[PDB]
Design an enzyme around this catalytic site. Sequence first.
Site, PDB file in Angstrom:
ATOM      1  N   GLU A   1       0.819  -1.288   0.432  1.00  0.00           N
ATOM      2  CA  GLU A   1      -0.074  -0.002  -0.253  1.00  0.00           C
ATOM      3  C   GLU A   1       0.481   1.621  -0.255  1.00  0.00           C
ATOM      4  OE1 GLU A   1      -0.700  -3.047   2.544  1.00  0.00           O
ATOM      5  OE2 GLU A   1      -1.859  -3.673   0.604  1.00  0.00           O
TER       6      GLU A   1
ATOM      7  N   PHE B   1      -3.174 -14.406  -0.198  1.00  0.00           N
ATOM      8  CA  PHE B   1      -2.199 -14.405  -1.574  1.00  0.00           C
ATOM      9  C   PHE B   1      -0.762 -14.072  -0.989  1.00  0.00           C
ATOM     10  CE2 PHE B   1      -4.619 -10.583  -3.657  1.00  0.00           C
ATOM     11  CZ  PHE B   1      -6.095 -11.550  -3.845  1.00  0.00           C
TER      12      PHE B   1
ATOM     13  N   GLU C   1       3.071 -14.543  -3.581  1.00  0.00           N
ATOM     14  CA  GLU C   1       3.915 -13.592  -2.478  1.00  0.00           C
ATOM     15  C   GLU C   1       5.011 -14.920  -2.070  1.00  0.00           C
ATOM     16  OE1 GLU C   1       1.918 -11.339   1.024  1.00  0.00           O
ATOM     17  OE2 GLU C   1       1.478  -9.924  -0.900  1.00  0.00           O
TER      18      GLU C   1
HETATM   19  N1  LIG Z   1      -8.305  -3.051  -1.592  1.00  0.00           N
HETATM   20  C1  LIG Z   1      -6.779  -3.762  -0.949  1.00  0.00           C
HETATM   21  N2  LIG Z   1      -6.175  -3.705  -0.781  1.00  0.00           N
HETATM   22  C2  LIG Z   1      -4.591  -4.094  -0.811  1.00  0.00           C
HETATM   23  O1  LIG Z   1      -3.803  -3.601  -0.928  1.00  0.00           O
HETATM   24  C3  LIG Z   1      -5.101  -4.945  -0.538  1.00  0.00           C
HETATM   25  N3  LIG Z   1      -3.739  -6.432  -0.223  1.00  0.00           N
HETATM   26  C4  LIG Z   1      -4.267  -7.276  -0.131  1.00  0.00           C
HETATM   27  N4  LIG Z   1      -6.114  -7.159  -0.478  1.00  0.00           N
HETATM   28  C5  LIG Z   1      -6.482  -8.316  -0.508  1.00  0.00           C
HETATM   29  O2  LIG Z   1      -7.525  -8.645   0.950  1.00  0.00           O
HETATM   30  C6  LIG Z   1      -7.993  -9.734   1.106  1.00  0.00           C
HETATM   31  C7  LIG Z   1      -7.339 -10.100   2.800  1.00  0.00           C
HETATM   32  O3  LIG Z   1      -6.672 -11.735   2.370  1.00  0.00           O
HETATM   33  P1  LIG Z   1      -6.064 -11.656   3.703  1.00  0.00           P
HETATM   34  O4  LIG Z   1      -6.122 -13.287   4.262  1.00  0.00           O
HETATM   35  O5  LIG Z   1      -5.813 -10.756   4.577  1.00  0.00           O
HETATM   36  O6  LIG Z   1      -3.841 -11.775   3.791  1.00  0.00           O
HETATM   37  P2  LIG Z   1      -3.850 -12.642   2.273  1.00  0.00           P
HETATM   38  O7  LIG Z   1      -4.412 -13.142   1.953  1.00  0.00           O
HETATM   39  O8  LIG Z   1      -2.114 -12.988   2.412  1.00  0.00           O
HETATM   40  O9  LIG Z   1      -3.969 -10.966   1.643  1.00  0.00           O
HETATM   41  C8  LIG Z   1      -2.351  -9.810   2.013  1.00  0.00           C
HETATM   42  C9  LIG Z   1      -0.873  -9.793   1.528  1.00  0.00           C
HETATM   43  O10 LIG Z   1      -1.604  -9.319  -1.009  1.00  0.00           O
HETATM   44  C10 LIG Z   1      -1.417  -8.279   0.141  1.00  0.00           C
HETATM   45  C11 LIG Z   1       0.171  -7.350   0.850  1.00  0.00           C
HETATM   46  O11 LIG Z   1       1.127  -7.589   0.043  1.00  0.00           O
HETATM   47  C12 LIG Z   1      -0.089  -8.833   2.159  1.00  0.00           C
HETATM   48  O12 LIG Z   1       1.099  -9.180   1.792  1.00  0.00           O
HETATM   49  C13 LIG Z   1      -6.599 -10.702  -0.380  1.00  0.00           C
HETATM   50  O13 LIG Z   1      -7.478 -11.544  -0.832  1.00  0.00           O
HETATM   51  C14 LIG Z   1      -5.970  -9.828  -0.474  1.00  0.00           C
HETATM   52  O14 LIG Z   1      -6.350  -9.958  -2.502  1.00  0.00           O
HETATM   53  C15 LIG Z   1      -6.107  -5.948  -0.496  1.00  0.00           C
HETATM   54  N5  LIG Z   1      -7.712  -4.254  -1.056  1.00  0.00           N
END
Ligand SMILES: Nc1nc(=O)c2ncn([C@@H]3O[C@H](COP(=O)(O)OP(=O)(O)OC[C@H]4OC[C@H](O)[C@@H]4O)[C@@H](O)[C@H]3O)c2[nH]1
Lengths: 251, 251
Positions: free
Chosen positions: B98, B174, B179
């Site tokens: 972000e 994600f 990653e």
């Molecule tokens: N609006 C929005 N902004 C963002 O910056 C963002 N980043 C992720 N997402 C979505 O939010 C949802 C929450 O999923 P979680 O279980 O909290 O975590 P992970 O699945 O591991 O995704 C987080 C990782 O990828 C991004 C960042 O680098 C971090 O390291 C996800 O489907 C993701 O696609 C986002 N949605």
Amino acid sequence: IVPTRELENVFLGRCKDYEITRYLDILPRVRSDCSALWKDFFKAFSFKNPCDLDLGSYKDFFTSAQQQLPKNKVMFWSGVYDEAHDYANTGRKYITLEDTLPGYMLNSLVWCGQRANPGFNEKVCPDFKTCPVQARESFWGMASSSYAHSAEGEVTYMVDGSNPKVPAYRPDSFFGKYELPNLTNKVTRVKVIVLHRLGEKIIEKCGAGSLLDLEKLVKAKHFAFDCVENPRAVLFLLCSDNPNARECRLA
Amino acid sequence: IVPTRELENVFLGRCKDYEITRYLDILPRVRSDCSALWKDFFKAFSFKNPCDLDLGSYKDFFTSAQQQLPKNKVMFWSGVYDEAHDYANTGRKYITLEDTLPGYMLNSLVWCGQRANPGFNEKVCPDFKTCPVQARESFWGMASSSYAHSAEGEVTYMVDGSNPKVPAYRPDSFFGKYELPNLTNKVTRVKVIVLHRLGEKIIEKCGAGSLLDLEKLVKAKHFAFDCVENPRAVLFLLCSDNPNARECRLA
Ligand SMILES: Nc1nc(=O)c2ncn([C@@H]3O[C@H](COP(=O)(O)OP(=O)(O)OC[C@H]4OC[C@H](O)[C@@H]4O)[C@@H](O)[C@H]3O)c2[nH]1
Ligand SMILES: Nc1nc(=O)c2ncn([C@@H]3O[C@H](COP(=O)(O)OP(=O)(O)OC[C@H]4OC[C@H](O)[C@@H]4O)[C@@H](O)[C@H]3O)c2[nH]1
């Protein structure tokens, strides 16, 4: 001092970004569009000596850009920018000037007028210690005045109680000059948060020194007053940056 | 869901604001124009049904928008948005997605294609929970792939160790999908921070369960690994929002 590049595009982009996506359930939208706000901001300083401004220069811009402020949420701060804005938490706990539309648009930006076309200087701005005070403070002093004049209910004020060189409250800070004296009878109470920085000598305390001066001024303006030093929520934020500090010892 | 208004104006304004004023001493500028970024971005989803995207769709946008990332400062997060971003602190302690140009421009925006003029839907977009997986994840998934690809040195991964419904580490998050697989040999170490939210029950611990799964994966890709649960700097930040929590008792 180097002026901000592409000043109009930066202003216009922050403006639109704010309008559509920033502080949506926290602060109201302004009536005027971004282009009308630029017209008012630019005319304040454009086509004049960079020192040829006064406290009325941006009056039309602040009238167009002023937002009604949420009661009991307005915060002022002196000497604790980082701690106050971390604690206020992007509008979630308190509003700071930096969250309001004009404060967000111009924060950190550097600009000045010139008489020759295009009416502003893209190369250099003077050190504003060189301009009369009313010119030097024309923008941020009127920002602080309009902000404080819109405050309602309890206001909060966070100060540094560990600075040997700078009293916690002083009449010559932006707060002492523009904010405290411009609080209206819609304000009920001034709540002071004193920061006692971790691992440093305590310089100022609630009810003594400049906090007592401030207390007197608050009561003379007919508001209630209270004051606290390192309330816990604030102490924990301090400790976060300095975990090994003695003040932060757990159970 | 309702799409973001004036998507181009928001994207362009955020783009120009970032370019000139944001993360100046923390992250490099991108060579591409704001207009050239907008074309790569718009063409990815425009004039197509809303669910017609896959991991490849936004490839040119992310190639253009990709910044070299500071060594050792790259952070990932799963399920702990707010706590990870408070601790990372707008780039001062760690970088998050972000804080990078593309993450900043699109963070929290909603947009979708349609086939008839103007090529995007300004009324309604589907909860992409209606779209196939690779179309839901098309944008943020390819963002996360490209970000992870650019990390060098130590990386840090903050997870929720208190969610009974969602494991700290998951191959389909994600982080597991986009990653972890894309960390290059420029990466030396995965540093895990497990958050145990205050007064909630403890679900995941270092060395056990899904974190053990993660530890084995990381070491098999030849990275060193460590793990800590509520390190003090994070703890104090949790306590500042819940100072009454038993875990926050002061000496
Ligand atoms: N609006 C929005 N902004 C963002 O910056 C963002 N980043 C992720 N997402 C979505 O939010 C949802 C929450 O999923 P979680 O279980 O909290 O975590 P992970 O699945 O591991 O995704 C987080 C990782 O990828 C991004 C960042 O680098 C971090 O390291 C996800 O489907 C993701 O696609 C986002 N949605
Ligand atoms: N936010 C901001 N951005 C800028 O780019 C800028 N340039 C000048 N200033 C002025 O420099 C001041 C900082 O000087 P201090 O001694 O730490 O404390 P006070 O003097 O009391 O300022 C804090 C009060 O004004 C805002 C807020 O409402 C708060 O109550 C800025 O405030 C602002 O008026 C600026 N303020």
